[PDB]
Amino acid sequence: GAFSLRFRKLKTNPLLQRKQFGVDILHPSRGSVSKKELVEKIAKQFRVSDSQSIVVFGLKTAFGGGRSSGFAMIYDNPNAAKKFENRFRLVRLGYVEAKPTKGRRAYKELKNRRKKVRGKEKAKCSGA
Template sequence: MVTPDVVFVFGFRTNFGGGKSTGFALIYDTLDFAKKFEPKHRLARHGLYEKKQQTRKQRKERKNRMKKVRGTKKTKVGATSKKGGKK
């Protein structure tokens, strides 16, 4: 028996005039497999993934911090969530 939480449907197209739609579905054995292979936007539709909301200002500050460093150091700068603010 397949439960609805392991069925992921997408790509629906409605036929002309309505009444019939065709689409695609992926059915996983377990929820863990679904979380491993499904894209995050499809998991969010099922309520299994919550994207962290970033404000526009936070994105802009992060971008400008990353512009100041070069190479592999960018990942370290981008990962820091809080930095000592200047007044």
């Protein structure tokens, strides 16, 4: 159904190599806006190189529907954006694949066993 973009609270941040701003959007008819569709429109507005520099988050639709508003954050380069941004925000976008770590309870059970053995402890890694 399309939407109308109009940013707010812009703050050029050269220390962090990024631009931060709230987006505000108007969409009569349509139910919400996906971030894959929003990142394409905010790219062509701001004359960006690459979608991977841009990262987007928040987005509540208000009560009633039609209106919505959220946050956004245009870096320069994707490699700077990968460094300073935490990984969970990038992942929703899909730029970076999720990292499969082991569980928190399982990790704790290693180190309490690792306390008990002095010397060479590394047999406990394969054993658990």
